[PDB]
Symmetry: D2
Amino acid sequence: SDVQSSLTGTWYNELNSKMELTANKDGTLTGKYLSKVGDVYVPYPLSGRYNLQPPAGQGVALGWAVSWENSKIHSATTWSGQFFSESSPVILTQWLLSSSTARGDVWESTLVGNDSFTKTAPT
Amino acid sequence: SDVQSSLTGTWYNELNSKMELTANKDGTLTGKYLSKVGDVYVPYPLSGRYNLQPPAGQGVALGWAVSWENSKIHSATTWSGQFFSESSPVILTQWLLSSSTARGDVWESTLVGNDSFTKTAPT
Amino acid sequence: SDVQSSLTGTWYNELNSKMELTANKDGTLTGKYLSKVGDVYVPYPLSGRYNLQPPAGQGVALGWAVSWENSKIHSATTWSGQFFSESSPVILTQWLLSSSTARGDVWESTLVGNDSFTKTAPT
Amino acid sequence: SDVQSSLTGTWYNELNSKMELTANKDGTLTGKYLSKVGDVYVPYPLSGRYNLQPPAGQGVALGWAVSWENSKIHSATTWSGQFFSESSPVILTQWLLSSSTARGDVWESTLVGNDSFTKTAPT
Ligand SMILES: O=C(O)CCCC[C@@H]1SC[C@@H]2NC(=O)N[C@@H]21
Ligand SMILES: O=C(O)CCCC[C@@H]1SC[C@@H]2NC(=O)N[C@@H]21
Ligand SMILES: O=C(O)CCCC[C@@H]1SC[C@@H]2NC(=O)N[C@@H]21
Ligand SMILES: O=C(O)CCCC[C@@H]1SC[C@@H]2NC(=O)N[C@@H]21
Ligand SMILES: [Mg+2]
Ligand SMILES: [Mg+2]
Ligand SMILES: [Mg+2]
Ligand SMILES: [Mg+2]
Ligand SMILES: [Mg+2]
Ligand SMILES: [Mg+2]
């Protein structure tokens, strides 16, 4: 099956955040992201891109972006990583969360972390 | 002016890569990215998101993704950072470049770097 | 706190790498690191620094460096993160692995990842 | 190579931070780091490691760590990158700044950035 058949759907990370992901035939990603951490309370939309043609036995490289804006927050996260559809499906990512700052404070504006997404919510 | 008025257009980074960026009213980013490094030879499409409503005197947080696939490459980069439209416009970013690997080799699959984009190509 | 009483010792990460860590009273880290991945085959020494006085209910921030040199490898990794002693001890880190390159190739010189260290080797 | 003959000394980054670096024959780095940003006001000691034998035309990979502790700060930074001595000397780095947090807040504990060090203070 094509990548979208395995990639489109709901994914959950270790923080119990929920991503409703759609992988389109043109290689784009769309959908909604609900973070269980940070001062956000509803899903925010995502946009990204993903590999259509992974070499056999290798991951689908992919990445996506979310802009977060509410009364208190003006930031954007990107996730970059690989989706593996075989055996135990997973999206293994690292992410960069850049927050709006004064130009002089750019040095302290970007958080880095890692998220692992699976098809079942963590207990 | 709204963010798109200042953000849409051609941007160049320190590597002399050229990004043709369009900032849409719905907060999405689209366009094309031509890297001057790596074994890629034509532009690749991008998708991302950006802040619509930056607090006064602060950056527009934003991020975008490119999937790179050709005969030799299966990878994806995301950039995360801030766009400043005042005085000397700049997009200051950090990026994560994830390459397709076997699942056991995920540890060595993600490069990290930084790109600074301006409105004029470097000499 | 007496951080060294909990921090000094052998630690194992998810890749089954083994770190023999000593935390000194002056806030320095020394020891040996044996990676189970990459083209390295013997332990390499480490040097780092760690917080001596963690706030109650919070992690000990710490970081260390390893220089790797053999016939084919010239690189260095740093790990940055937090050590939690109070329950299920762990060192949660992100790391940066910089490899020797030509100056023009710096953009592709740094890998990023994450390692979780515990007191028992993974099965 | 005799790396220490070029590496030991005072270095300045883009933020006008000043690092007094000593590179020892055993491959260790020691010295003092004075940051011009963040709520720190005195130098803090560093510990690290560096490549002793760079391949011709390539950088010396290196990394170091600083633990920062004062009345309000408990954090640690590591820098990872490359030192180039042969022309216009520079240390090109990326860094990870981990701050003490509750275990549940680890996701927001690590900043990432980049520092370029040269032998002359920025204007
Ligand atoms: O606090 C913000 O600026 C907005 C919410 C950010 C939540 C981040 S995104 C990376 C990490 N993974 C998640 O599922 N949530 C956090
Ligand atoms: O080599 C690849 O896997 C595809 C090309 C990657 C080029 C990267 S993306 C980050 C950095 N910034 C650029 O303008 N080019 C490189
Ligand atoms: O390949 C090299 O350049 C030297 C070995 C690097 C091994 C890395 S360090 C980060 C990660 N964690 C480990 O325990 N091993 C790898
Ligand atoms: O705020 C802290 O937690 C301690 C000071 C951190 C200063 C950082 S380290 C990375 C960057 N480079 C510098 O020269 N200063 C900042
Ligand atoms: Mg909200
Ligand atoms: Mg091509
Ligand atoms: Mg070896
Ligand atoms: Mg895990
Ligand atoms: Mg101080
Ligand atoms: Mg610069």
